[PDB]
Design a protein around this ligand. Structure first.
Ligand SMILES: Fc1cccc(I)c1
Length: 163
């Protein structure tokens, strides 16, 4: 298991524009297109992202390319963020995947409220961090995915994704 397999499990693969769990236009392996209610705005974002007139539909190769770019962008954002980088660098490789997963789903601004969780993770207080991570809108709105990510932080194993 690696970050790509982990997020592919959590996000699925759809080749036509769909709506994510928040109702926002998305495509591929969880690639957010826009928060605008305009499908035309989403289609414009898609064409810009792919470099051709897509009509709201992409190929698997294109979905995987966007996915690679999105994972890399999450990593580079963590590494540029003075609050996130020290915690990320303190983690083992499996838990780093859980960190990328959260940033992929909610962005750097979505994780800004997790300061206390981040401190517990840096302190390697895994059970306490897991309890704290679940006290969140994130956990309440996507509990099965949050449970998998939290189990990954709690245990440092892939058990939630093998199961
Ligand atoms: F960017 C980061 C670093 C550590 C933990 C999380 I959640 C995000």
């Amino acid at each position: 298991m690696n970050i790509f397999e982990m997020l592919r499990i959590d996000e699925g693969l759809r080749l036509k524009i769909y709506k994510d769990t928040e109702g926002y236009y998305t495509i591929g392996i969880g690639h957010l297109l826009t928060k605008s209610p305009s499908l035309n705005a989403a289609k414009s974002e898609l064409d810009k992202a792919i470099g051709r007139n897509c009509n709201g539909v992409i190929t698997k190769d294109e979905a995987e390319k966007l996915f690679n770019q999105d994972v890399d962008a999450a990593v580079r954002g963590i590494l540029r963020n003075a609050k996130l980088k020290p915690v990320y660098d303190s983690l083992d490789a499996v838990r780093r995947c859980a960190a990328i997963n959260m940033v992929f789903q909610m962005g750097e601004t979505g994780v800004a409220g997790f300061t206390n969780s981040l401190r517990m993770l840096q302190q390697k207080r895994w059970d306490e961090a897991a309890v704290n991570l679940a006290k969140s809108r994130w956990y309440n709105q996507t509990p099965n995915r949050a449970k998998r990510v939290i189990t990954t932080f709690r245990t440092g194993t892939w058990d939630a994704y093998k199961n």
